[PDB]
């Protein structure tokens, strides 16, 4: 059975191009417009991977990060953070909240997919 | 005494934020097309090309603000008047934003409390930019989720000139800032303005264009209800 | 007083010029592809996409300069050192400039008077950036018509540190300017610097990176012959 | 019997895309890397249309424009100026030197071709 990826970002333009590249590999994609919706969908299924933006209305990515490593079922879901927040302490804080890899925008889709494949091994 | 250098430094940071977002799409879509030719149907190909084209046009608007900013500092911004029907011109603006407006489910309307044609001796390009600027904020500062969101341009003849009103059911403008929003670089740094692109120059350019026509611009708005931007220009001859 | 304001206003204009040229390419190529899929062979289609991709990476360079500029005014630029083979890293930088190089009929060289590998405790990202800026200027300021143009990296150890030299066949740098090219925004506005993309931030960013490593940078140049930039860094542990 | 266009700009990236859209319509295209190289080619042939950049090494577009208004057989050749020079004075100067149309870049390739067709019919 194919791996499922939860794709969380406020930008429709961004999710469209990330979803397309994920499906090129044969993954299944579930989309979330903000951090609140992302958690609401995690009560229904468990993805093999989460792609997470930081700056979104309602609930930002830093809060999502902290909440996932507070629920025993979600601690082990690997998260890639993909964000335009190229801050120096932005990355460190994401890594200390449980993120496996922090990738900046603009990004290379191929590099992004190499990193996605790496955490799915 | 010069906070200018402070506001100009965050202006650089705001240029970078406005540059970063479209560029993310352009790079990611362009490299995806290049590496996905066997994995794209014709419709997805064209729509990915449209994203590139639409994101480039955002960059071009960014570029034209920096150019216009250069014309503001150099006091060289200049209008060129023509005999122009304002009913037609305002429809050229609502049509040119009807698409971007629908991307947020905001309907653009035009009501003229007078008979057309509305003849006035104005700069058709620069007045179009004024209308587009204020129509653009009407969509960009729309209420996030909202029933029947609109932006309306209301033509009128008042006090020996033409009164252009642009009303919206948006998030509104707080009273303490109702004056400084026309200052260069000024943006209301609220919470519902987190990931909203902007340089803080649109209204400063709008105000300068309108005054060069001999007119004035001011705003009425309450927080939560909406905003009405008033543009008044003499008819001229 | 603080002429910094006037220098930042010319900075805005330079940003707008550096944004204009890649955007022209991106807009025209993307809309041509969109309107010409029936007239593009596969080879021309990929060629046009590569222009978009290459032009969008010019804009990414501009983006990163504005962010680094923000990290200078804020005095926030930091480095993260790690045990790094410096031979593999300069070789990494000549591959990232070789395409953009031959775009201007210029080859890139890398001699090394010291056996590889050369282990140094440096920030590999920022040193690579320093190398790329110096290499970029080598080809961006190569002699106009003349042939055999080259930019050469010479890696060596001297005075208890590592000495990197970047030498080129450039237009040269006048002596009245050799002592200010490293300052922010400053640019030689000579005749043969017409349509040359330029922020004037590069060498300032380079200098701060080099000094954060505890090193210094300096230049020797004669108009007509070319330029030599020296970067000296302690080896550390 | 296909019309010829002389394409004069220092940028190869630009000459390539403009040349491609010109040949879609069936025009022949002759390229010039600068204004001096341009005029050297008007000695060998006479084009139906000139597309001209302003900022170039060796010889800029303003001096090209006036030398065309000078010579008798160059006088009547249409010239579209396509330039990054956005100033109102730059256009007026170019117009007063005989250019029939000035278009700024970034430009729309189809708007550009519509004006090319208009000046050749
Ligand atoms: N229709 C509107 N509704 C609410 N706020 C607005 C509206 N138009 C302008 N503003 C406020 O005015 C400020 C400056 O606007 P503007 O000069 O157009 O700059 P920009 O749009 O580039 O941020 C913004 O912070 C924005 O919040
Ligand atoms: N290799 C070189 N040859 C000639 N001139 C150079 C070289 N490197 C830098 N310069 C001059 O130093 C100035 C400052 O360089 P830099 O800070 O890199 O500005 P920019 O970002 O515009 O290249 C530039 O105007 C350029 O004229
Ligand atoms: Mg976001
Ligand atoms: Mg040119």
């Amino acid at each position: 059975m194919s791996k499922k990826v939860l794709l969380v970002d406020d930008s429709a333009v961004l999710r469209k191009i990330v979803s397309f590249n994920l499906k090129k590999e044969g993954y299944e994609v579930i989309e979330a417009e903000n951090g609140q919706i992302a958690l609401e969908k995690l009560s229904e299924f468990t993805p093999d991977l989460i792609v997470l933006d930081i700056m979104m209305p309602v609930m930002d990515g830093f809060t999502v990060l902290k909440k996932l490593q507070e629920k025993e079922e979600w601690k082990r879901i690997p998260v890639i953070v993909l964000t335009a927040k190229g801050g120096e302490e932005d990355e460190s804080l994401a890594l200390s909240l449980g993120a496996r890899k922090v990738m900046r925008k603009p990004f290379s889709p191929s590099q992004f997919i190499e990193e996605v494949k790496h955490l799915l091994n | 005494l010069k906070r200018i250098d402070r506001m100009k430094t965050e202006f650089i940071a705001n240029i970078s934020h406005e540059l970063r977002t479209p560029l993310t799409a352009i790079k990611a879509y362009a490299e995806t097309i290049y590496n996905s030719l066997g994995e794209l149907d014709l419709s997805t190909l064209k729509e990915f090309l449209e994203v590139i084209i639409d994101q480039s046009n955002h960059l071009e608007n960014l570029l034209n603000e920096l150019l216009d900013f250069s014309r503001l500092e150099r006091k060289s911004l200049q209008i060129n008047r023509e005999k122009v029907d304002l009913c037609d011109l305002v429809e050229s603006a609502v049509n040119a934003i009807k698409e971007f407006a629908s991307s947020h489910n905001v309907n653009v309307l035009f009501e003229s409390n007078v008979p057309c044609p509305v003849e006035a001796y104005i700069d058709p390009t620069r007045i179009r930019q004024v209308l587009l600027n204020l129509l653009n904020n009407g969509v960009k500062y729309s209420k996030k989720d909202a029933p029947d969101k609109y932006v309306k341009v209301i033509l009128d003849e008042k006090d020996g000139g033409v009164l252009i009103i642009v009303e919206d059911n948006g998030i509104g403008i707080p009273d303490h800032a109702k004056d400084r929003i026309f200052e260069q670089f000024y943006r209301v740094d609220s919470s519902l303005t987190y990931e909203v692109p902007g340089t803080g120059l649109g209204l400063a350019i709008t105000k300068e264009i309108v005054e060069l026509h001999g007119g004035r611009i001011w705003v009425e708005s309450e927080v939560g209800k909406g905003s009405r931007f008033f543009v008044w220009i003499p008819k001229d001859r």
Side-chain angles (χ1 to χ4, degrees), chain A residues 1-3 5-70 72-113 115-121, chain B residues 1 5 7-74 76-82 84-97 100-101 104-105 107-108 110-118 120-141 146-147 149-151 153-166 168-174 176-177 179 181-182 184-188 193-194 196-221 223-224 226-234:
Chain A
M1 190 173 178
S2 63
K3 314 252 173 74
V5 175
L6 176 61
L7 173 57
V8 196
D9 177 311
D10 41 317
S11 173
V13 162
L14 181 100
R15 312 196 295 280
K16 191 192 269 163
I17 199 67
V18 172
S19 171
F20 170 93
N21 278 285
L22 292 175
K23 307 221 222 182
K24 256 180 53 171
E25 306 303 322
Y27 306 138
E28 188 173 321
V29 181
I30 291 89
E31 295 189 20
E33 283 83 4
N34 60 51
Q36 170 83 76
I37 302 178
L39 309 165
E40 297 178 0
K41 308 198 138 174
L42 280 150
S43 67
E44 306 173 337
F45 82 114
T46 290
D48 301 77
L49 172 63
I50 301 179
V51 170
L52 186 55
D53 181 28
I54 295 291
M55 330 197 271
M56 321 173 260
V58 181
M59 179 175 175
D60 69 87
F62 291 129
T63 317
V64 170
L65 277 177
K66 162 182 151 196
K67 292 204 184 249
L68 308 164
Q69 57 169 16
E70 286 178 354
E72 208 271 321
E73 303 79 342
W74 302 338
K75 332 161 158 161
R76 287 177 210 81
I77 310 180
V79 179
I80 293 182
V81 166
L82 177 63
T83 185
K85 263 196 158 158
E88 323 78 35
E89 303 315 320
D90 287 326
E91 173 181 19
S92 297
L93 160 69
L95 292 181
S96 71
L97 284 172
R100 302 280 230 282
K101 184 60 180 165
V102 172
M103 235 164 312
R104 276 132 202 110
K105 282 156 178 192
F107 67 100
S108 161
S110 69
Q111 299 182 1
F112 166 76
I113 287 296
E115 184 59 38
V116 161
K117 289 170 165 178
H118 177 244
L119 312 173
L120 298 173
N121 292 340
Chain B
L1 314 150
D5 199 85
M7 288 176 80
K8 247 184 222 179
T9 269
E10 175 64 31
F11 177 51
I12 312 285
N14 283 337
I15 295 175
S16 68
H17 301 344
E18 274 217 55
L19 173 49
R20 184 177 46 207
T21 317
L23 181 62
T24 295
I26 294 170
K27 176 183 179 66
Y29 277 74
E31 187 214 283
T32 292
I33 299 176
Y34 186 85
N35 294 130
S36 303
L37 276 182
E39 301 112 281
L40 282 166
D41 58 70
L42 185 59
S43 283
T44 315
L45 176 57
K46 314 182 93 121
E47 89 154 325
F48 284 9
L49 287 163
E50 294 163 18
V51 173
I52 297 179
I53 291 166
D54 175 65
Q55 297 302 323
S56 309
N57 284 329
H58 297 355
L59 287 184
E60 170 165 26
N61 294 333
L62 171 58
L63 170 63
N64 285 323
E65 282 201 343
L66 311 185
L67 295 183
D68 280 337
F69 168 84
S70 184
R71 301 189 179 101
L72 287 204
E73 300 284 296
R74 279 153 35 206
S76 76
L77 185 55
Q78 183 235 5
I79 70 179
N80 294 117
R81 306 170 169 277
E82 317 173 15
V84 163
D85 173 26
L86 271 153
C87 295
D88 169 20
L89 160 67
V90 69
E91 300 183 277
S92 170
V94 304
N95 291 342
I97 194 138
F100 184 91
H104 306 60
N105 307 282
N107 192 20
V108 194
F110 165 47
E111 162 146 1
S112 177
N113 297 347
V114 291
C116 308
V118 168
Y121 190 55
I122 77 194
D123 187 312
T125 317
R126 287 303 190 174
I127 300 304
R128 186 179 195 256
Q129 166 177 19
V130 162
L131 302 183
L132 281 180
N133 166 230
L134 304 156
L135 287 167
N136 191 69
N137 303 86
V139 175
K140 144 162 44 171
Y141 300 98
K149 289 180 303 153
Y150 74 87
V151 55
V153 286
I154 310 167
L155 251 186
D156 212 17
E157 305 225 83
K158 177 97 180 143
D159 296 319
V162 155
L163 192 65
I164 300 179
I165 317 179
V166 191
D168 61 64
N169 54 32
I171 69 190
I173 307 180
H176 72 329
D179 189 24
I181 61 169
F182 300 95
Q184 307 186 351
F185 308 151
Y186 187 90
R187 322 189 57 199
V188 160
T193 52
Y194 194 3
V196 155
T199 42
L201 290 173
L203 290 182
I205 295 161
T206 300
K207 179 176 180 265
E208 176 69 13
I209 295 184
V210 158
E211 290 185 0
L212 284 175
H213 282 77
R216 292 295 177 274
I217 179 167
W218 68 92
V219 64
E220 279 152 23
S221 192
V223 194
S227 298
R228 299 220 297 181
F229 283 83
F230 294 83
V231 183
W232 176 87
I233 300 105

